[PDB]
Amino acid sequence: TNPPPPETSNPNKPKRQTNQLQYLLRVVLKTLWKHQFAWPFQQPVDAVKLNLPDYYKIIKTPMDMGTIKKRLENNYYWNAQECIQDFNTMFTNCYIYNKPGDDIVLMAEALEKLFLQKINELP
């Protein structure tokens, strides 16, 4: 019922660790990960356990911080833009599937505000 999760390693994808990617893991990801509202975003949406039979009919580019964390740890990304895009996709999916005022949308907005503050200080 769930799709395979996004890959976190790919032996054919060139790997890199720039100073910006280092900041993305050690400052940006870590700051969001320890936030009180991180828990919905620390693993893929489990549409089986959450009883969301239409989630992966609507969301075709799933992303979550657990995936992002592993990608960063594995040096999966070539540049910071790829990682920033993954964060943006995660938030966007939440806004697509849910509705204004839903608790989960308010949590995403709080996390996104923090993300934006930290990205503004990228090396």
Ligand X SMILES: CCN1c2ccccc2C(=O)N(C)c2cnc(Nc3ccc(C(=O)N4CCC(N5CCN(C)CC5)CC4)cc3OC)nc21
Q: Which residues in this chain contact ligand X in the complex, by CB under 6 A?
A: 39-41, 45, 50, 52, 94, 97-98, 104
Instruction: Say if CB 55 and CB 74 are below 8 A apart.
Output: no
Which residue in the shown chain puts its C-beta closest to ligand X?
40
Distance CA 92, CA 105 (A): 10
Instruction: Say if CB 38 and CB 32 are below 8 A apart.
Output: yes
Q: How far is the CB of 14 from ligand X (least distance, A)?
A: 30
Q: How far is the CB of 53 from ligand X (least distance, A)?
A: 11
Distance CA 118, CA 103 (A): 23
- Considering beta carbons, is residue 62 or 72 the nearer one to ligand X? 62
- Considering beta carbons, is residue 48 or 122 the nearer one to ligand X? 48
Q: For residue 92, what is the enclosing H or E element?
A: helix 80-97
- Considering beta carbons, is residue 7 or 39 the nearer one to ligand X? 39
Q: How far is the CB of 67 from ligand X (least distance, A)?
A: 12
